[PDB]
Design a binder for this molecule. Structure first.
Ligand SMILES: *[C@@H]1O[C@H](CO)[C@@H](O[C@@H]2O[C@H](CO)[C@@H](O)[C@H](O)[C@H]2NC(C)=O)[C@H](O)[C@H]1NC(C)=O
Ligand SMILES: *[C@@H]1O[C@H](CO)[C@@H](O)[C@H](O)[C@H]1NC(C)=O
Ligand SMILES: *[C@@H]1O[C@H](CO)[C@@H](O)[C@H](O)[C@H]1NC(C)=O
Ligand SMILES: *[C@@H]1O[C@H](CO)[C@@H](O)[C@H](O)[C@H]1NC(C)=O
Ligand SMILES: *[C@@H]1O[C@H](CO)[C@@H](O)[C@H](O)[C@H]1NC(C)=O
Ligand SMILES: *[C@@H]1O[C@H](CO)[C@@H](O)[C@H](O)[C@H]1NC(C)=O
Lengths: 230, 316, 36
């Protein structure tokens, strides 16, 4: 417990340094702001164009020109400005459609990773999911996924089954390993070996169909209780 | 079969609309900055297409290989691993897929940019994924790769769907034979159906039709006296030829805007499948799926990825 | 001190010591925190 708590504290200490020292960590949140600003600035700047008219501002066009020769220039300017507004509206629609798809995923991740524990691989982090915490951002959300990563592996030799008294024994929820001479039962995700016993193994069939079976002895808990009772 | 990316195209306004005409270029300058934003949108689409292929295949930082001696407990795996005999280093199924789908011109300021990841790199990525999932189970998607004999990994995967370990061990030869027969029949099923791979040819044909339609619009009067700028200029007074020039400019600009908008919509719909292929890779390939009808039809055991011209093929 | 142009390297390369009666089991773990 103490080692795990210390590891968690150190990992949650490192994250602030990683966010601060490394720049451009929030590029995804800034790209949308930059795109919106660029689109709006382009829309505003398009008011200085004349689209073939003698002037851009309407005041001078109405001033120095008679109405009969002004109903053409004004109409051309109106057509240009309407065509400039339509594209902005359409691009905003497309960007909103993209942001909605990016926010549905955030809602799904919140529901299925903060309020529970995820079993799907690589949905929430790299490793085996334990828990995650949400944090707010200027226009988004930041998740801190806590995961479990194994390390310091060692190699053994294994067998699929154990033959004893003409019976084949399979592990219940583990594997059979060997440190060179003896045989143990351990969980697959962590090395914690135990003596082979008729409690963590079950019998099914004999030792002819299975290929790769080995020979060993299976401890019986009833042996010493018989001798203890006179 | 899932498509992950399409071709990248770059369009130049000046060459497409004007055609190295000084009068047209000077006259076009009064419309503002339509072409800067058109080029920006096309470049954004191209960069998105480059990003799409990286999130599907580039999921392993390390390149694994299968041992030179192959004895996987009776399972064949010869139809999916790369073949040293072939000079392209591709599996027979990948070769069949590449032969089954087959695809040029460059005019009027329209260019096609080559992809960043060449097909050899995609094949290498898929080979690494296969050689990692065969000799190491699903452990290489969480931490370091840990070896485990293949029959034991299959016994692990049988426990996931609720069948005890001994079912596999007492039926190992039968299961191996069934798997080999299914793998063998997959090639014949894929090769003898002329519409199996129609999810990618649809994309290719749609892009080709769009590009062909865009170029065909260069030969329309739009109300002017000719579709060629030089013929208009030579057979009319250039001081009073601005009406025809402006009409042609308006028509060509409208065509370009329509093409760009439809390309944006198509890219938005392609990304929705590029984001599904990555999820399927992560969940079916790097692990085992308990979700119903996600990876195949039935109880999932394992999946194998195969590359395609512009997609990916999963064998569930 | 210059600008160079090379061909991409896909990543680190290794081979797993696969055998038909060999297994590797981790003996420790680490707790990591990610950002998204
Ligand atoms: C593997 O672990 C077993 C279990 O401890 C070792 O067997 C022990 O060896 C010591 C040293 O001779 C004895 O004092 C113990 O009584 C043994 N215990 C058992 C369970 O019999 C064994 O030496 C280790 N190494 C190998 C290669 O098997
Ligand atoms: C681990 O691998 C080494 C390789 O040289 C081998 O000698 C050793 O016996 C293995 N450990 C086992 C099987 O306990
Ligand atoms: C592993 O391969 C060796 C070499 O052929 C063989 O002798 C041995 O019986 C095999 N073990 C298994 C997994 O049955
Ligand atoms: C293992 O046990 C079986 C069952 O009694 C016996 O027939 C065999 O000779 C023993 N030796 C082996 C193959 O390990
Ligand atoms: C796989 O099947 C082929 C069929 O021709 C056979 O020649 C080969 O020995 C088998 N084993 C492997 C792994 O290639
Ligand atoms: C496991 O890692 C911890 C990290 O502090 C270390 O203290 C410990 O000695 C390691 N033990 C093993 C089993 O490698």
């Amino acid at each position: 417990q103490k080692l795990i708590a210390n590891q968690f504290n150190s990992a949650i200490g490192k994250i602030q340094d990683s966010l601060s020292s490394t720049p451009s960590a929030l590029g995804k949140l800034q790209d949308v702001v930059n795109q919106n600003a660029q689109a709006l600035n382009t829309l505003v700047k398009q008011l200085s164009s004349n689209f073939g008219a003698i002037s851009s501002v309407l005041n001078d066009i109405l001033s120095r020109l008679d109405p009969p020769e002004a109903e053409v220039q004004i109409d051309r300017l109106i057509t240009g400005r309407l065509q400039s507004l339509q594209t902005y509206v359409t691009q905003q629609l497309i960007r909103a459609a993209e942001i909605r798809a990016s926010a549905n995923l955030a809602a799904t991740k919140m529901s299925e990773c903060v309020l529970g524990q995820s079993k799907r691989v690589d949905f929430c982090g790299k490793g085996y999911h334990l828990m995650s915490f949400p944090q707010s951002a200027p226009h988004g959300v930041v998740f801190l996924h806590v995961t479990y990563v194994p390390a310091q592996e060692k190699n053994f030799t294994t067998a699929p089954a154990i033959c004893h008294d003409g019976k084949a024994h399979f592990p219940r929820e583990g594997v059979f390993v060997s440190n060179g001479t003896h045989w143990f039962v351990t969980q697959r995700n962590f090395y914690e070996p135990q003596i082979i016993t008729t409690d963590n193994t079950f019998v099914s069939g004999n030792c002819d169909v299975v290929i790769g079976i080995v020979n060993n002895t299976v401890y019986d808990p009833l042996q010493p209780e018989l001798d203890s009772f006179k | 079969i899932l498509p992950v990316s399409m071709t990248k195209t770059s369009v130049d306004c000046t060459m497409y609309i004007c055609g190295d005409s000084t009068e047209c270029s000077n006259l076009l300058l009064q419309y503002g900055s339509f072409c800067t934003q058109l080029n920006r949108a096309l470049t954004g689409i191209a960069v998105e297409q480059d990003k799409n292929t990286q999130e599907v295949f580039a999921q392993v930082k390390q390149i694994y290989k299968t041992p030179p001696i192959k004895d996987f407990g009776g399972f064949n795996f010869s139809q999916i691993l790369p073949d040293p005999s072939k000079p392209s280093k591709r599996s027979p199924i990948e070769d069949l897929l590449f032969n089954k789908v087959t695809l040029a011109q460059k005019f009027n300021g329209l260019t096609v940019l080559p992809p960043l990841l060449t097909d050899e790199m995609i094949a290498q990525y898929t080979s690494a994924l296969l050689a990692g999932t065969i000799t190491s189970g699903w452990t290489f998607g969480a931490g370091p790769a840990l070896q485990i004999p293949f029959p034991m990994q299959m016994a692990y995967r049988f426990n996931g769907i609720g069948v005890t370990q001994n079912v596999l061990y007492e039926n190992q030869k039968l299961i191996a034979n069934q798997f080999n027969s299914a793998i063998g029949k997959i090639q014949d099923s894929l090769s003898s159906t002329p519409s199996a791979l129609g999810k990618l040819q649809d994309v290719v044909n749609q892009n080709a039709q769009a590009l062909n339609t865009l170029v065909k619009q260069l030969s329309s009067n739009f109300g002017a006296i000719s579709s060629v700028l030089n013929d208009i200029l030579s057979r009319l007074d250039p001081p009073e030829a601005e009406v025809q020039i402006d009409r042609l400019i308006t028509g060509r600009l409208q065509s370009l805007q329509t093409y760009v908008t439809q390309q944006l919509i198509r890219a938005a719909e392609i990304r929705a499948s590029a984001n599904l292929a990555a999820t399927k890779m992560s969940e079916c390939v790097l692990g085992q799926s308990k979700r119903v009808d996600f990876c195949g039809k039935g109880y999932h055991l394992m999946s194998f990825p195969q590359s395609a011209p512009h997609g990916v093929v999963f064998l569930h | 001190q210059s600008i160079i142009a090379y061909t991409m390297s896909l990543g680190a390369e290794n081979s797993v010591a696969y055998s038909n009666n060999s297994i590797a089991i981790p003996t420790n773990f680490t707790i990591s925190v990610t950002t998204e």
